[PDB]
Design a protein around this ligand. Structure first.
Ligand SMILES: OC[C@H]1O[C@@H](O[C@H]2[C@H](O)[C@@H](O)[C@H](O[C@H]3[C@H](O)[C@@H](O)[C@H](O[C@H]4[C@H](O)[C@@H](O)[C@H](O)O[C@@H]4CO)O[C@@H]3CO)O[C@@H]2CO)[C@H](O)[C@@H](O)[C@@H]1O
Length: 219
């Protein structure tokens, strides 16, 4: 599939790829997402974009998302994941990130949360998460800048890699554990509802993110 419309989507196995140009009215340009595979084991895809204007507004979050059995964060044992990706053009203002949502209501809309957990594998052009940097966190032996921000309904923790990580393998539950244990995250009353990986562009391009593999599961 070739996904160019705002909410063009394709599912295969437990992976759903969404072009997700949720911010397209904030600027001028286009974006198309290509799915290479999407099976029970993993997905491969790419997205090519060019955006101008609205320089402090995100245009899109094209992504692959996992279908999983929703549960309380405190009941999760592991969220193993691998991500391998690259950009052809890094002269851009954008980031590459895991995006997860949690809500007290297990039927909450899946494009937002009571809480959000992001893990930024890269940022370009100095773009930053919502809020402020509140800590340096060491998670599974690796250091992340930890940001916390809120817009009055959604509270968002962003872990940011000091240098880009183009080949990631880890357990996302280590980050929830860290939040639960160190920042009072309410794991025992929050359902994990969404688990995605993709890129959030502000300005630049043409530029293409190639995701050679993304895999995840929730146990
Ligand atoms: O998909 C259908 C649905 O989309 C709605 O729009 C959602 C997007 O789906 C979703 O991906 C997006 O998520 C944001 C999240 O809210 C941000 O917190 C997060 O971080 C931002 C940060 O908040 C900014 O300050 C900073 O500058 O950028 C970072 C990312 O760089 O980013 C994710 C991904 O962009 O939220 C959208 C809602 O705002 C539609 O609105 C809805 O109509 C559709 O049905």
């Amino acid at each position: 599939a070739q996904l160019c419309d705002q909410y063009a989507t394709y599912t295969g196995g437990v992976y759903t790829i969404n072009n997700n140009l949720w911010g397209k009215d904030a600027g001028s340009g286009s974006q198309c997402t290509t799915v290479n595979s999407a099976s029970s084991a993993g997905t491969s895809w790419s997205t090519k974009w060019n955006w101008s204007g609205g320089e402090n507004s995100v245009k899109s979050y094209a992504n692959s998302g996992l279908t999983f059995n929703k549960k309380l964060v405190s009941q999760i044992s592991q969220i193993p994941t691998t991500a391998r990706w690259s950009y052809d053009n890094t002269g851009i203002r954008a980031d590459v990130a895991y995006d997860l949502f949690t809500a007290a209501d297990i039927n909450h809309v899946t494009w937002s949360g009571d809480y959000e957990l992001m893990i930024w594998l890269a940022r370009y052009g100095g773009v930053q998460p919502i809020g402020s940097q509140i800590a340096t966190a060491t998670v599974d032996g690796q250091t992340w800048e930890l940001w916390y921000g809120a817009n009055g309904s959604q509270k968002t923790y962003s872990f940011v890699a000091p240098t880009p990580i183009t080949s990631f393998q880890g357990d996302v539950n280590d980050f929830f554990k860290y939040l639960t244990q160190n920042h009072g995250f309410p794991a025992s009353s929050q359902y994990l509802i969404t688990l995605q990986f993709g890129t959030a562009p502000f300005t630049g391009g043409p530029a293409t993110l190639s995701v050679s593999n993304w895999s995840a599961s929730v146990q």
